Amino acid sequence: GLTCVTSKSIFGITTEDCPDGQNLCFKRRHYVVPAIYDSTRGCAATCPIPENYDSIHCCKTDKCNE
């Protein structure tokens, strides 16, 4: 199925063959402190709605959420 990054960091890269009915990848950008942003990634059925002043990018190709 669609492949997405479910984790990316100084400890490496996790990639998942997405559960059926999840044909979207997402990458959330979250401000923790002034110059520091936590990124979160995964597969989803629908694009998650951003909160906390976050921004979220959603896309539909393999590992598009790098």
Side-chain angles (χ1 to χ4, degrees):
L2 176 69
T3 280
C4 304
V5 185
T6 61
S7 175
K8 181 168 183 168
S9 64
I10 58 180
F11 309 112
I13 308 169
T14 311
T15 276
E16 173 169 293
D17 187 350
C18 292
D20 69 327
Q22 295 184 30
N23 213 45
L24 188 147
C25 303
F26 75 81
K27 178 165 124 173
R28 177 190 293 99
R29 178 151 167 94
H30 172 63
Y31 169 93
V32 187
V33 240
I36 310 185
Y37 284 96
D38 207 38
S39 284
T40 56
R41 298 171 176 77
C43 305
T46 53
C47 190
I49 312 296
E51 302 200 270
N52 307 133
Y53 298 103
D54 293 354
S55 73
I56 290 175
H57 182 82
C58 286
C59 52
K60 304 199 61 167
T61 52
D62 290 330
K63 289 188 285 176
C64 66
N65 71 321
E66 200 74 68

